[PDB]
Design a protein around this ligand. Sequence first.
Ligand SMILES: [Cu+2]
Length: 102
Amino acid sequence: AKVEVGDEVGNFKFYPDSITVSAGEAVEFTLVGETGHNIVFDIPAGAPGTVASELKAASMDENDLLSEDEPSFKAKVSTPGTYTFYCTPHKSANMKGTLTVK
Ligand SMILES: [Cu+2]
């Protein structure tokens, strides 16, 4: 699945902000525009340790930002469920999305 992160106008949005994928399908996030952004998954409370580890592996390090030098990030989540992801710099500006894994 492909998700665009930001736009040419500098809005703090994921495009689209709700994606549904099959187990193990890569989600490629690609930066659009010049504002750097990243993608970090929220870990659901009470998630099993295998899901917590998958989500951490599918998250950017919060000291990492996409830039036109590092324009994409690829995440794979195998466990069925819905998961929220957010951008660290623009979290308070509600730059967040949902990933449903079938
Ligand atoms: Cu951002």
